[PDB]
């Protein structure tokens, strides 16, 4: 199954805000690939202000580093990834949505599919 | 000067009639005054708060189909996308 994760990583280190998101992506990608998975995209969204002052665990956030990860993995490991995301202080919000592959093996992320690039092959041409 | 509402600006290169120089024309203009109105699936914009913040109110209430003018399918998809965006910490 193809899945699209959209994480909202915290940025406490002001001088290098991307520092957290990089190691988040590294951890999740390592898990996926070591569990017979594949990572198709790690599309970075930017630093953005959250709509509200969201309180993950016992610390309040007003902004976060948004990032998207498109990855092919099985249901069990996808649940495991969601579990690790939900119990990580670094992550404020997380969400994994399926991308249906009944038509096409190759499919771009939601952002590129919205821009018009239906599959990764268009995105690389 | 006069209020711009009470006056009519005839565009450039357009044909006109004497009727156009009248309050009837302005009144008739008042009475007879996009991305989702297309093949695009609104459910692909669930991670794009800027696009689908156009189809909500200042307080965030999804606009009725009478307002958005979308098809029933695209109204349903847009509402689903907006709710999903609200859930995933965007919006």
């Amino acid at each position: 199954m193809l899945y699209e994760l959209i994480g909202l990583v915290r940025i406490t280190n002001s001088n290098a805000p991307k520092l957290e998101a990089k190691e988040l992506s590294s951890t999740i990608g390592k898990l996926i690939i070591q569990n017979r998975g594949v990572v198709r995209d790690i599309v970075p969204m930017g630093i953005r202000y959250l709509p509200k002052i969201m309180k993950k665990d016992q610390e309040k956030h007003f902004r976060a580093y948004h990032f998207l990860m498109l990855f092919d993995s099985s249901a069990a490991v996808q649940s495991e990834i969601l579990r690790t995301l939900k119990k990580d202080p670094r992550v404020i919000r997380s969400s994994i949505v399926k991308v249906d592959l009944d038509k096409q093996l190759d499919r771009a992320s939601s952002l590129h599919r919205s821009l018009g690039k239906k599959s990764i092959l268009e995105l690389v041409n | 000067k006069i209020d711009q509402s009470l006056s009519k600006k005839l565009p450039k290169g357009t044909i006109y009639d004497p009727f156009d120089f009248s309050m009837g024309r302005i009144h008739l203009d008042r009475k007879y005054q996009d991305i989702m109105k297309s093949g695009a699936n609104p459910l692909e914009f669930y991670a794009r708060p800027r696009i689908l913040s156009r189809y909500v109110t200042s307080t965030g209430r999804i606009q009725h189909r009478d307002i958005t003018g979308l098809s029933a399918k695209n109204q349903r998809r847009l509402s689903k996308a907006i709710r999903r965006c609200q859930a995933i910490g965007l919006m």
């Binding site: 991307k18 998101a21 990089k22 992506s25 590294s26 990608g29 390592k30 690939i33 990572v39 790690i42 599309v43 970075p44 969204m45 930017g46 953005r48 998207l68 952002l111 | 794009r48 708060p49 800027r50 696009i51």
Partner: peptide, 22 residues
């Protein structure tokens, strides 16, 4: 892990065109 490392470095560290949506 090698491809993961290459992509993570290039995609994040470089002043790359992000999908900031504005």
């Amino acid at each position: 892990e090698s491809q993961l490392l290459k992509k993570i470095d290039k995609v994040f560290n470089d002043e790359t065109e992000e999908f900031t949506d504005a």
